[PDB]
Structure 1
């Protein structure tokens, strides 16, 4: 049944837009540099990213800003949410803690004025613009070149996959803090950039996927997992069952399967059927066990009972098991 997967992958591979977003981002960055508080702003990464396989018109860029000397306070033992504490341009923003809401209020404000020179902002992903066909969600992230927080100490378990040498190099790179609530003055750790590095450099062999003898199927199974969820999230668009599931969950599940099957020979493209089945099976195992460790913060359980109700897990579990037992009808359904 694998050739239907390649058929689905063939269609995804094919599905002037990027020119318009590049221009708007260029204008937004330049005027954001005008402000004292957002002076060192630029693109983090390459001004494009499609979190949605199925939505080529839905872009997502991230604006980064370095915070030279911060001290983080772990909010209430969540391991992933922190207060940002510290001649500094950001003291315009509530006590000792840097206010996410105030910093987002000014960020939204400057962009709302900038697009008036038809780009439209949606109602209060800090900002999402509609350029009337293209959506672009802009996120503000704080950059810190200091060493990673202690909660990331046992994460990124890639030593047996991409090597301990690589893991030590990745951890020397900066981490990022993004605003999200609860105590609405918290920032959440973000390692978006590392995952992009890992995916585009995914093999144990440095020449993985650079010749016919070493063609893997890691990227293909990830795309098919994200597509599988995206279709299911849309089939139940109207209802609310799958609103708390994201592509971050399928991507986190994928990296764990990469840790579990580190050799390239376990990802031979001739066996796309079984590997993709194996990844569907792991993601289902996490749904039932209600355990899905954040790949970088192992004590942060993405599938906790306090974040996602077992009702929704049991629902998503039955949808996926029906698809897998029936050659995935949802792939050609829309």
Structure 2
């Protein structure tokens, strides 16, 4: 209870100290990237830390609009797709867009451009930069078409953020990122990280949530706290590969489900940070035990399916988290 705000205090102090040096490089990369006719409309999506415990690790996403796409779902995976349709003809491999070819010149253009003042050296997160500062550059195809049919009954936020917001969110473009599946080397996975940022910073039922003292939720604090919890446990057992396949996308997804089941702002009063976090920890454990964690936008996709993560990893993380929660979280 009081220890959590202690943890939240030492986390916020890591933001008073490099993101300018990040902008100086990515703005130089984007210029020469726009010179190539294949990456003409390239631009930034939203710096963003995927790891809360790594304030020197940044993550960017370079978007590129592909006009008039038609997708083909790869073997009922509901998340991975082929790209049919043109300044991308050089990257064709038949009538599909080769995720391998298009990403190869992307790596090459970056490698050529970073040599003139950095050591770009590394899937979808194709290139990582070393500046004692890290940024990972992801290439994303933008499609202003309607969302795929696998996302029809996803983003169920009507009782929390309203249906007209859901309608407006679904009018936004969606993004595709080169992810291999099973590998099949030319598949692209859907991505709504732009929608997720819209949800976290516009998170209340009331429009004035977290804008005044009487309406101060504790959502963002709960997500930071369980994000930091997994990042810590991944570091404690890093040299043992137990928690290798768990990432922040899991805890962020479990957070979105808790936001829907607890739609009212009154259920997130900052006075109850302890119980709120304890309820967040419980739901995530319930997904570990029942081996079921739907993708928040693609509900037919189980992030915790037996094909992606084994039962032994879930049981181990369960034992770790349960031990932390019973001992006032010593890993913090």
How would you bin the TM-score normalised by the shorter chain? over 0.9
User: Structure 1, unaligned stretches of length 5 or more?
Assistant: none
Q: Deviations over 1:207-243 (max 9, x none)?
A: 0111110000000000001000000001111111100
Q: Deviations over 1:111-170 (max 9, x none)?
A: 000010060022391100101x00110000000000000000000000000000100000
> How big is the shift at 1:91?
1.0
Aligned pairs (5 A) from 1:1-334: 2-15=1-14, 17-45=18-46, 48-86=47-85, 88-93=86-91, 94-117=93-116, 119-123=118-122, 125-131=125-131, 133-181=132-180, 182-330=183-331
Q: Deviations over 1:262-309 (max 9, x none)?
A: 000110110000010001000000000000000000000000000000
Q: Structure 1 residue runs of 4+, over 3 Å off?
A: none
Distance 2:269 2:55 in 1: 29
Q: Deviations over 1:308-328 (max 9, x none)?
A: 000100011100000000000
> How big is the shift at 1:19?
1.1
Stretch moving more, 121-130 or 63-72: 121-130
Number of residue-to-residue matches in the alignment: 325
Q: Deviations over 1:79-114 (max 9, x none)?
A: 00000110x111111011101011110000000000
Distance 1:51 1:328 in 2: 22
TM-score (norm 2): 0.97
1:310–1:21 Cα change, 3 Å: same
Distance 2:228 2:89 in 1: 43
Distance 2:36 2:73 in 1: 30
